[PDB]
Design a protein around this ligand. Sequence first.
Ligand SMILES: Nc1ncnc2c1ncn2[C@@H]1O[C@H](COP(=O)(O)OP(=O)(O)OP(=O)(O)O)[C@@H](O)[C@H]1O
Ligand SMILES: [Mg+2]
Length: 437
Amino acid sequence: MKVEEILEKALELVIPDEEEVRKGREAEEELRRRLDELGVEYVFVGSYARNTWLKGSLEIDVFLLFPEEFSKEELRERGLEIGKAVLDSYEIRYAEHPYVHGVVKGVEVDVVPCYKLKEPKNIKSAVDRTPFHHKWLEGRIKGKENEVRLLKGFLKANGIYGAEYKVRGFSGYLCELLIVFYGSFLETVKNARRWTRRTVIDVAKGEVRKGEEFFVVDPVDEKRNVAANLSLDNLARFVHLCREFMEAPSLGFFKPKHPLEIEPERLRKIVEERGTAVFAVKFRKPDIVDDNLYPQLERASRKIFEFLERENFMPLRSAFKASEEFCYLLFECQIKEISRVFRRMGPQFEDERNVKKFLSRNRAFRPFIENGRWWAFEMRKFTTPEEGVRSYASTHWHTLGKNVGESIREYFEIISGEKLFKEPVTAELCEMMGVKD
RNA sequence: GGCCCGGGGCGGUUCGAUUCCGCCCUGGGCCACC
Ligand SMILES: Nc1ncnc2c1ncn2[C@@H]1O[C@H](COP(=O)(O)OP(=O)(O)OP(=O)(O)O)[C@@H](O)[C@H]1O
Ligand SMILES: [Mg+2]
């Protein structure tokens, strides 16, 4: 098992077979026909246009070009009108920039409205750079589309592909930019082993320099960081994956990881061994787009974790999971139960003014002096992580994300013990605790 | 929607808060949905 022979076998998993390619071409042809009958101005971009789409993940992108003068509202209505009229079955679900997703002769299709600008200077719609991305790539990626495919397959199998908030990883465009910069998949991996959180890649200048943070400047817009949404941790995972791969090649890196079914009875034993407090906040999932949801689940989860730490429950890690029914914020603390009393720091014996105010407080145990300053024994309002979060989430629901908070406000519960291991969160929990196997 | 930077008003907690927990108003960037 050497890189060379492995990279060779890997092409069999990333490159689309003659039939899938035919299915794509056939679907492409039908799109043209439907669009041409409408006399609409369009252009094919993305993976399909450059033949860099991942085997099994074919999606065609059709961009409807509209004059800059048109209203953002006109793009939406006209664009959605054209999309719907041109797809076999469709769906309209997006967070901000409008588009229509659908199917044509079996292949996934995205019909997207955008302004046809000159120069990607001061973008008007969120997607206006895309057409220029294509113009810049088509004549440079030619000859290395399979190299691109290796990178996509590499990141996909290790959960860091997409750039959407659910993944916070490497976008497809980012992948192609990296291929044009390093020349191949093996070269990208080799060099990625030495990236830092300060690494700056400027493909248009053929330069790598140091900067404020990880930055891949778009050749089409020097101010656009193509990797703006690639999280620090995922950047760290990829770098480490590149070290491991080069240290011990294996097409296991291109195979999606084991589904993992581990029994609930086993998770219970582990928890028992860890002696930790493992609970979750469960509430109804807001009827919103993934891209609006996850950033809210991250915020709610974090705001509760911070409460758990300043509250001295010694939180270990947090996680979250969304089903179609509900959401779950998961937690694990080192403290299952803390005392009722604690000590609050008072003023230095020195100034009687504040000391006087400090001791006038109606107290249960009477303050004392230690190392030159007063201290007082205080009582808590709750002694466990669960009671703490129940209180917090009931009162601070508004700070837990616009939609997520509003849902928690109308209903939420804290699950623990045996009743928790039944919910659809076993995977996340094992992940969260580092259970190996 | 989320994040970052800034105005202006507030409540709570505290011996002590611009600084700790939060709430209203608001300006400017950025990101995800292609
Ligand atoms: N987050 C993004 N950052 C930069 N460019 C993007 C982004 N999302 C989409 N694009 C542009 O739109 C095109 C289509 O994006 P899409 O989400 O369909 O993925 P793709 O690039 O087609 O690759 P793949 O379909 O294999 O994931 C990209 O090639 C790129 O030019
Ligand atoms: Mg596509």
